[PDB]
Amino acid sequence: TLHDKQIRICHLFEQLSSATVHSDRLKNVGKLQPGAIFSCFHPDHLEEARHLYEVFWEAGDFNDFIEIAKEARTFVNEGLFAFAAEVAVLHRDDCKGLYVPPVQEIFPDKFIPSAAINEAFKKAHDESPILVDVQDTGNILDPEYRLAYYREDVGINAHHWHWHLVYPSTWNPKYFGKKKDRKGELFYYMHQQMCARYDCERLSNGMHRMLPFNNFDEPLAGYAPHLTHVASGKYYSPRPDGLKLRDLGDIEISEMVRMRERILDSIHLGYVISEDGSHKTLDELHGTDILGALVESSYESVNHEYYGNLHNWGHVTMARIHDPDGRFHEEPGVMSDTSTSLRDPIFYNWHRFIDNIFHEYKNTLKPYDHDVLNFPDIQVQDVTLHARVDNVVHTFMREQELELKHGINPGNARSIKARYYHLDHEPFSYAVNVQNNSASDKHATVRIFLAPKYDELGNEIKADELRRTAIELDKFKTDLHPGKNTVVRHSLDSSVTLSHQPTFEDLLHGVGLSEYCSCGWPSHLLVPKGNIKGMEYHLFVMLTDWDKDKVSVACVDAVSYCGARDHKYPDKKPMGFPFDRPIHTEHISDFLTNNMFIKDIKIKFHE
Ligand SMILES: [O-][O-]
Ligand SMILES: [Ca+2]
Ligand SMILES: [Cu+2]
Ligand SMILES: [Cu+2]
């Protein structure tokens, strides 16, 4: 049955660091040593991961796939293996309906500090349950340690791992049959929302918006991650203050400057150059997706030779800055890995730089006129946010526990849990009042966004600047009958959030329970933290005509950031509409058509 199939998949992913401590099918794999940190960005690591998941994809049927897997995990790098098997489980038809084990439970040592992991391994020296509180103690000397609740959140780092595995940069469409609709553009939009959401935490905390890493000579600020790799005793190398990017054997920094300059040229000329010397136009309909593919870069870049691989070489050269040529035999920092790279403050400097390349392009597009915004005869008359106090959302920290036993060797304890704390918010709902003055039923997509109202120094953020910090809260279809309507929507139904990741124990049992994919934003992080007086945000609701938006769907719980399984992205509008193009008005209230509304709410943290 499917429940048996699920138990056999959980066992692929169990004590995977110990899994080490051949078949002509597995001849090109086994290059990266077990114990080494696997890079999700480096070309030669992604090549070996592709080779392994190609074997898994061509495995004649499910039992043959558990077999080759059970064997390849004996010798290949274990990070590489979790990567290749989760791409296989997501895409193989005979794995449909099967969940992959939670990644923070496969690799507990990437989500919890060396100190807690060591204490757990230590106190495992009866039968009894170990519990370690992660919570530390120390001289808080760095103001950045204030955003650690966001950067080091378990749920955000697990989402980023899972997104890059629904949308692989090595995805070859001709080999799979299958195309990933608007993969380049969703690369863009997901990493833009991670930056936009991060800048709402800086401003929540009284800090300035993050500045782009746009000059490659400037020294980086430092960050020590304090993560071990128990599979070998290696750690993610820390980065002290004041180092500058240095050439690696595989890439020179001047080659990166050169890729940036070639990309900006094409954006200012309106066309890119295909491999055959010909011109492809950066039209309004495909321009962001062509640019996503050559900036990341993916396998689908129109010209890899000429535009290179800028975003991904940025991860590799920042992760190796402590040892650019390998003479120290030191492991990369957390920027090498999609499960850890959001922890480092430098992630946001680099991805606001990359976002600025997409924004130059968006800036060559014409502002929307009233025609492309308006949904005529629809008028929005009111939004209210209902919570304990109406139009105030409350946030707070909350304790949680993570089970380490399926990922580190447990001996005889039945359970080693580490307890950590994370931001969370009270439940809320919206109520939108809409007047439908046609005399027919209409169908609307309701689009909901949140935007800070003022910067950290109390100045009003103008309309155009709001575009960079507006975060998506929801997108859903509603039918409207003639006359007055009131749409009610609950926060829990958010289409940017994962509603539930089942644990290893939920799954080996039948308690992980269609919506079986793990990509999606964490529910506890739906809104920014705000601050203890109540930080003011604009809440924007827009309705547009769904018969013009619409494009059997598994895995749509987080459609907005993750798309739909094996399906086209279900919204024809550009990702981030209405905020993706230049707004020529000083104030956001003068942008508003009748089918748009802003309500000012407050987010108020409780200490
Ligand atoms: O990749 O972020
Ligand atoms: Ca959801
Ligand atoms: Cu990135
Ligand atoms: Cu990423």
Curated annotation (Swiss-Prot):
Subunit structure: Hexamer or a multiple thereof.
Pfam family, one: Hemocyanin_N
Matching SUPFAM superfamilies: Di-copper centre-containing domain (SSF48056), E set domains (SSF81296), Hemocyanin, N-terminal domain (SSF48050)
MF term (GO), any: chloride ion binding
Species classification: Eukaryota, Metazoa, Ecdysozoa, Arthropoda, Chelicerata
Organism: Limulus polyphemus
Functional note: Hemocyanins are copper-containing oxygen carriers occurring freely dissolved in the hemolymph of many mollusks and arthropods.
GO annotation (BP), single: oxygen transport
Protein name as catalogued: Hemocyanin II
Glycosylation site residues: N436
Family annotation (InterPro entries): Di-copper_centre_dom_sf (IPR008922), Hemocyanin/hexamerin (IPR013788), Hemocyanin/hexamerin_mid_dom (IPR000896), Hemocyanin_C (IPR005203), Hemocyanin_C_sf (IPR037020), Hemocyanin_N (IPR005204), Hemocyanin_N_sf (IPR036697), Ig_E-set (IPR014756)
UniProt keyword annotations, A-Z: Copper, Disulfide bond, Glycoprotein, Metal-binding, Oxygen transport, Secreted, Transport
Disulphide bond pairs: C517-C555, C519-C562
Binding site for Cu cation 1: H160, H164, H191
GO CC annotation: extracellular region
PROSITE patterns: HEMOCYANIN_1 (PS00209), HEMOCYANIN_2 (PS00210), TYROSINASE_2 (PS00498)
Modified residues (Blocked amino end (Thr)): T1
Residue positions binding Cu cation 2: H311, H315, H351
Entry's family note: Belongs to the tyrosinase family. Hemocyanin subfamily.
